Write a protein that binds this ligand. Structure first.
Ligand SMILES: O=c1ccn([C@H]2C[C@H](O)[C@@H](COP(=O)(O)O)O2)c(=O)[nH]1
Ligand SMILES: O=c1ccn([C@H]2C[C@H](O)[C@@H](COP(=O)(O)O)O2)c(=O)[nH]1
Lengths: 316, 316
């Protein structure tokens, strides 16, 4: 079925990946270099063998797409994927006056009595970002994230490039171009960012009226990360194809280091017992064409019928 | 044999690639997204089914490695891969006083009586670059090429990053790093360079004392280009492994658009009749460790026994 490539990457890491330490007290099993294809005319690759929240995956992408770097848009669609990086900033800053909150990510997962204060402060931090304008502008704004790297790359003569807007324009006028490339890796920010981007670079490709997209992903968490990554970029393929009025082609997903966390073996094995169902269909608004001004209600998912979600611990 | 992946990419493009126009009056057959592996402990992947000039492939890489961007180093090892980009500059410039030389690449291949003056001027241009210092500095210097993109990426606050020197340092001290990435794509130069780099980005990887390298190549000429590309980067894998004292692992070659030019079908079919021979062995100087100061005589090839070379026309 559509998703087999992903079930094949999980199996491949299980009986083939080697043990490799990382930023965590536990390790990972990992491989290096891996490529998968999804024919997007076959259906949309949201996993069926595990419930994946599309609304999250899509409100994040819109954010990227508007070139926004402020958490606030996200909070307003109840999407919190990005709160820990914002709130970190808050905490290491003058203006903050609360229980230190040092190394809160690790310590969220030991103490059930800290994990309860972290969850209080965070709710207030989210609250202030949502209502206090001055506040958002100071700690709601992440600075370097995909949205500005895509739509406002800072030059050396202090202006701004919209890589993606220009690229889309190129697709419209030089479809056979071999240089349709949006990159998110700036070698001058990289050594001082707490997260240099995982989604390093991608490249668009046109042939016979079809748009395809290859993603170069330096590092992928097979269980938690890669199910979301797949849908993000398959959605982007669709949106760009829609804006250029091209038919949709293939999403190619290339990896550097694909890993599975050692405390996720059981969950992943559980996943491999399930038998894929038919893929959902994606469905974009026909009246609206500028994808830059797309909203939530413009992108529908149809016939998504997943297995239950698989809760799992996180890696810290 | 070691090279099968390449013979498998050529076949794959033959009975599977679709017709696609490009910068040339002829087309290309092409595919999008492709990955190959070469286990470098099995031997060095210089093609055996077609004579490939190692000396060229290596004097180019040393140049990159010294962070040089001046043609002159190259001329001094009789390597001309880069002369047309230098000389172009010359020609569209005040100081030049000769037969116009407009669109010389196309017109080199029609007129056997132009192709003879182009070959005269070029010999003089090469001569001046070799002997006139002021001259080299003005037209010998290509500006943006791999050597400065690797070793002197210009920042926004007007300094210089040595991506590769830093990366190597990282390999030495954080071998399990998932961010060992040297990128050659600067979104701010890209729209005004006559050749935005083909070799877009690469990433190093370490496990069990072995170094591997994945290359993201946006565009590859399967017949002319890709045999050289393979050895460049397999050499680089070796040199970096040597400097970090790690064993050598795999070279993974990832492609965006892999193409074959329509006037190279016959040559490629001829190539597929040949039967690979055993791979040559690479052999680097043990006394010298700083790869930045490696010379020609420090890198030997052993037991390279190729088939004859396959001359072919070029695409213009
Ligand atoms: O969409 C995402 C976002 C993050 N990660 C993971 C990969 C790693 O587990 C971690 C990044 O750590 P480094 O790879 O930078 O060291 O985030 C994913 O797999 N997918
Ligand atoms: O080492 C090299 C250098 C160049 N090319 C080719 C690929 C294309 O034929 C051409 C670049 O043109 P664009 O892809 O930028 O349009 O150079 C290679 O395959 N390998």
């Amino acid at each position: 079925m559509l998703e087999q490539p992903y079930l094949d990457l999980a199996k491949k890491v299980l009986d083939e990946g080697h043990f490799k330490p990382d930023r965590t007290h536990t390790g990972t099993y990992s491989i290096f270099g891996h490529q998968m294809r999804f024919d997007l005319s076959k259906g949309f690759p949201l996993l069926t063998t595990k419930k994946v929240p599309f609304g999250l995956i899509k409100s994040e992408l819109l954010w990227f797409l508007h070139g926004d770097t402020n958490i606030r848009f996200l909070l307003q669609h109840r999407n919190h994927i990005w709160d820990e990086w914002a709130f970190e900033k808050w905490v290491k800053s003058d203006e903050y006056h609360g229980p230190d909150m040092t190394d809160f990510g690790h310590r969220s997962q030991k103490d059930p009595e800290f994990a309860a204060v972290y969850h209080e402060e965070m709710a207030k931090f989210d609250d202030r970002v949502l209502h206090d304008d001055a506040f958002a502008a100071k700690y709601g704004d992440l600075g370097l994230v995909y949205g500005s790297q895509w739509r406002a790359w800072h030059t050396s003569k202090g202006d701004t490039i919209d890589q993606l807007g220009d690229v889309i324009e190129q697709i419209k006028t030089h479809p056979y171009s071999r240089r349709l490339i949006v990159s998110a890796w700036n070698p001058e920010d990289v050594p001082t960012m707490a997260l240099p981007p995982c989604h390093t670079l991608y490249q668009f490709y046109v042939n016979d009226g079809k748009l395809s997209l290859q993603l170069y992903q330096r590092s992928a968490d097979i269980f938690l990360g890669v199910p979301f990554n797949i849908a993000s970029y398959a959605l982007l393929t669709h949106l760009v194809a829609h804006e250029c009025g091209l038919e949709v082609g293939e999403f190619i997903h290339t990896f550097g280091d694909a890993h599975l966390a050692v405390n996720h073996l059981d969950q992943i094995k559980e996943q491999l017992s399930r038998t894929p169902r038919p893929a959902p269909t994606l469905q974009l608004n026909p009246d609206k064409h500028d994808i830059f001004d797309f909203d939530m209600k413009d992108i529908k998912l149809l016939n998504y019928d997943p297995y239950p979600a698989i809760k799992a611990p996180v890696a810290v």
